[PDB]
Amino acid sequence: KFEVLLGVYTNAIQYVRFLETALAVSCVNTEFKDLSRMTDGKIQFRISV
Amino acid sequence: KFEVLLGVYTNAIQYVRFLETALAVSCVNTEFKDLSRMTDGKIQFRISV
């Protein structure tokens, strides 16, 4: 006469990449080139209308 | 002079079995022959968050 263990079950998670989501439509990724910019502030960006 | 029975009729029995009904859609049936020898069952899940 016995008792049983009828099975082990474990979740598997599927990782999400940022670019696979549609949210990347709103923002544009770029290389970490902040060193060329000085004082971390954005460049003048002269605009003429 | 006479009286004569017109006919004798019997019902033919109708059998229903579990696997053919739609209810079986809910279950997964494992034929476990010597079940009476079983004390307790167990299923252990691990879920990592």
What does this entry list as its resolution, in Å? 4.0
Chain A closest-CA separation from residue B12 CA (Å):
42
Q: Are B47 and A8 in contact (CB under 8 A)?
A: no
List the one residue out of A19, A35, A48, A13 whose CA is nearest residue B47. A13
Report the structure determination method.
cryo-EM
**Contacts A13 to B, Cβ<8 Å:** 48
Is A1 in contact with B40 (CB distance < 8 Å)? no
Instruction: Copy the structure tokens of residue A28.
Output: 């544009």
Rg over alpha carbons for chain A, rounded to the nearest Å, is 26
Q: Which residues pair with A2 in a beta bridge?
A: B38
> Distance between CA B9 and CA B12 in Å, rounded?
9
Contacts of A3 (CB under 8 A, 6+ apart): B38, B39, B40, B41, B42
> Which segments of chain A does DSSP mark as H helices, in order?
none
- Distance, in Å, from the CA atom of B39 to the CA atom of A5, rounded to the nearest integer, reads 11
**DSSP class of residue A2?**
B
